[PDB]
Amino acid sequence: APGSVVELLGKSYPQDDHSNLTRKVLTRVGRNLHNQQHHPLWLIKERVKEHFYKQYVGRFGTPLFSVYDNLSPVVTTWQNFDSLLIPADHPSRKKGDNYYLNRTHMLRAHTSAHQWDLLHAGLDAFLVVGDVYRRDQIDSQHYPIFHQLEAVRLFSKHELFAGIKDGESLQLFEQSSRSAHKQETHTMEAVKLVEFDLKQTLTRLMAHLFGDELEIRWVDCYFPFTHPSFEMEINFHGEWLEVLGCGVMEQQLVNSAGAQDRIGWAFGLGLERLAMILYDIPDIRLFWCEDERFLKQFCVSNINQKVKFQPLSKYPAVINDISFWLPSENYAENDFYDLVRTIGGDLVEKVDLIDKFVHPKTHKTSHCYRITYCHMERTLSQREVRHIHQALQEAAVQLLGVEGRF
Ligand SMILES: N[C@@H](Cc1ccccc1)C(=O)O
């Protein structure tokens, strides 16, 4: 029966109460833009690889980062969440925000879903590069599929302290208390040196990519799988924008994988955000077009070329509002955004939820959304926008159970 199973790459996934993949999102699996020669996301991947191969120093010799850029994005919820100490009630698990094949399997929402497995295989240094998947809003800075680069680097005790003359007393581990600055089983000596290595390598990487005009800052933050943790923000177009999260790996995670004689750092870089800043790319949909006007601008002889995408003129937009009554107590905005992606695809530039109200006589909730139809590569005709918008109205009633207003 329709809707009972999803098949992907030869495997079958029975559908249940968690299942929420759209056909549209599934058609993106395997595209692997980060492996497409000359693609801007591939360019960033290659430049990061070169950084660690040529410009990262280790006191015992540079670790050698093995690179995994072709792992299937289908993961278990154990890989994506439990292995990273993400609590069962954590909002990052909500059905509204993740593409679940079912209660047990999902499309990975982050490349951190592979940390535990690669640590458990015994690696001390690795990169993971891949497409990741999240349910989210529609605008020029958000897409249901994007790409991350994960890095993990572990140190042994004498490796971390190798530059210290009287360092035989120094330890990685102790039994004390957790503070804002360190985990309960880490010494402050070890945390300071791991943090220094992590921030130094990331600063050097960004300085190479952007030059020394770059304005960056570190923001103290929280993740369940690192502590202390930071985000790096870059000041771009007058605002501070996060480009990566990182930190000192939680020792329970590292110990659980079998590396109890190691302390580590890890980071996760958003490739599209970096590429949009670095290359003057104004809209995330451009990564997904095959327009030779776009792809030819990144075919460079040296991966370190300072290319500046020259954008096309903006084409005219058609703006249409759409309003409906929500079903009785079963609806997420992201269900509508998924349907917009399904029907309108890359014709849709942005969707804003403008108005919401409750009607007293019926107790129903009305939403009104504003849809900006504007294509990156061509002028949309009024007629074709009308036909797409009509299809959207009809699909919302049929599939989401809404009752149309206008
Ligand atoms: N996985 C985190 C980023 C991260 C990776 C590794 C360590 C810390 C943070 C994210 O997707 O936002």
Author numbering: 10 to 415
Copied sentences from the primary study:
Mutations in the mitochondrial aminoacyl‐tRNA synthetases (mtaaRSs) can cause profound clinical presentations, and have manifested as diseases with very selective tissue specificity. Among the recently reported pathogenic variants are point mutations in FARS2 gene, encoding the human mitochondrial PheRS. Patient symptoms range from spastic paraplegia to fatal infantile Alpers encephalopathy. How clinical manifestations of these mutations relate to the changes in three‐dimensional structures and kinetic characteristics remains unclear, although impaired aminoacylation has been proposed as possible etiology of diseases.
Using steady‐state kinetic measurements of phenylalanine activation and tRNAPhe aminoacylation, we gained insight into the structural and kinetic effects of mitochondrial disease‐related mutations in FARS2 gene.
